[PDB]
Amino acid sequence: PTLTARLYSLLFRRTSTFALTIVVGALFFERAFDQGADAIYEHINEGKLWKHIKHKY
Amino acid sequence: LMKIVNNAFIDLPAPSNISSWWNFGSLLGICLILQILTGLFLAMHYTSDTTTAFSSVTHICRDVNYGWIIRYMHANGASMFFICLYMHVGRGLYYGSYTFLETWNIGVILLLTVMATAFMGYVLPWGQMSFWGATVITNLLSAIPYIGTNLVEWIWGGFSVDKATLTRFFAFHFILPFIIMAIAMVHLLFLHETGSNNPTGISSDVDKIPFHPYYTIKDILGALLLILALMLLVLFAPDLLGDPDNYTPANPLNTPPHIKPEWYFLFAYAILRSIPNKLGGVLALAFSILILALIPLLHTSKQRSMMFRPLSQCLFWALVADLLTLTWIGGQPVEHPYITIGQLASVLYFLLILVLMPTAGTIENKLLKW
């Protein structure tokens, strides 16, 4: 079986599980997406932000 | 058990041939809730007094935890409101929905409710255009004989705008959207006796379908693009539409050189500005809106739509230009190159409606023998 079908019969079949899945993924997703944009935002504005001038003072 | 009313919103019969235009008819349900939701939290900090109001705005834009957003989700949200209307109102013209006579007239009273609401919503923060924008619009009612000076003084709580006239709006303004929230339910009730009105114009009773899976998600999709095209403004260009002057405190002893209310009046403001006379231009304004009630007595073609009337198509989108002109021509000052256009364009507005759109169906009936 593909990952998809293995994914279906484990999680996406029983609705009680299907809601348990989403908060789990969301709970971890919050931990990645913030780190991503905060770094990209840091990266694009390299040499401008407070944390980049946080050591001098 | 009252859930069964949501047969209206769950198991409703509606067509299948439906565009994404009619999403706009639904977004106002979101904009109306979205605006109140924002504006409510917003108004936990506003103050209905002069000396503190403009500060009481900046109390939000600076010190409040994410209070700065709520001003702009509200303000520019009030503009994405209209952008749905003037696609939603132009619709029924182009698809012949005004025939639902019991409904189209309701479609007026919602509008006039808003165009007297949104006005009140611009003046609360005293942006130096608030005041004069309140003065220019409100003073026009003085044009009336024998009561003009009395009403305007009566609504000016005296002799001109002041602390009292602020507070007379913040309560008139924080209330009406609920009156819209109610009348909107009426606007749907008369519909539910007949259902929607397809682009063709034909009774599609043979091909009506549910609403919970299909148009729901479509409306969400419609809603998703709205929030997108609302987040862009607030996030990337909140200064775009709202004139910059509205951040200046208000002072009756200093006018700006150029004055214009917010952009959306301008199709109508320009009409008044064209007429050098005072009163005789006003009654064009109120008639520039109430004419929509006059249309259903001018449905000539024994067809309904304009999908099947290529001549009227040439005249319909033409009207959109004249609006997009009058939207802009009012936005610019009073000088000779433009005044010559307002005297034309404003006449074109009345002209296309009351002469030629009937004239098309008078012809198109005859090209096809009825």
């Binding site: 944009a37 401008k48 003072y57 | 600076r62 299909y214 997108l228 910059p244 002057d245 509205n246 951040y247």
Partner: protein
């Protein structure tokens, strides 16, 4: 007679994800204090708004301890002066507008809190205002106190030239030329009328990478349901 449109200058923040060079905010604040704050009543800001942007807690608090502020009803029933604290807004120059008009040629400095967003072009205007003082042209005569600058409407302003090369000196020691001053100040003023610029772009960015990611999936979920009826053949089979 004419207006004047400033050009579209580049900046460290003109991009749709370009934030402010907070360093450039730092030296700009020195300019407001040495120069502007004798006549510009910026009221809608306090030193505590400078924390986490250009200075620290202690360094900013040092500046409130610097200037005295009117505060307190004494138990004797009077008012006194104390060193400022963070919660106090900027020391206003003059108690009212009139004294500012009397301490000038009848004209009034506008506040700089929201001047940038309250003036067409904002920074480009304000930068090109200071850096557009020039000798008058032919045929023009101007009263006393006034001066010439095209960008200001009417081309007649009661603005004494406030900036000149090495009117002051900054801390890190950059070249205190008339331009580098004008950048850091105009960079400052945008922050005054936008304490949210840094965070505006963050949610400015987080939006797309949700909506750009969602909006197709919804556009599939739409097409997932409608596909029953996007694919439907009919017929007509009477006797």
């Amino acid at each position: 007679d004419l207006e004047l449109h400033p050009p579209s200058y580049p900046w460290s923040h003109r991009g749709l994800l370009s934030s402010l060079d907070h360093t450039s905010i730092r030296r700009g604040f020195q300019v407001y204090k040495q120069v502007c704050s004798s006549c510009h009543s910026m009221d809608y800001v306090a030193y505590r708004h400078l924390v986490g942007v250009c200075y620290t807690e202690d360094e900013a608090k040092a500046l409130a301890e610097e200037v005295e502020v009117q505060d307190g009803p004494n138990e004797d029933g009077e008012m006194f002066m104390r060193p400022g604290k963070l919660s106090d807004y900027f020391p206003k120059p003059y108690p009212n507008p009139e004294a500012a008009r009397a301490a000038n040629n009848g004209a009034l400095p506008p506040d700089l809190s929201y001047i940038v967003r309250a003036r067409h072009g904002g920074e480009d205007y304000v930068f090109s205002l200071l850096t557009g003082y020039c000798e008058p042209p032919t045929g023009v005569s101007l009263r006393e106190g006034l001066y010439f600058n095209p960008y200001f409407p009417g081309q007649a302003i009661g603005m004494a030239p406030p900036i000149y090369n090495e009117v002051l000196e900054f801390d890190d020691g950059t070249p205190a030329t008339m331009s580098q001053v004008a950048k850091d100040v105009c960079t400052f003023l945008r922050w005054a009328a936008e304490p949210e610029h840094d965070h505006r772009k963050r949610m400015g960015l987080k939006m797309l990478l949700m909506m750009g990611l969602l909006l197709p999936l919804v556009y599939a979920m739409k097409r997932h349901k409608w596909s029953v009826l996007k694919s439907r053949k009919l017929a007509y089979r009477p006797p």
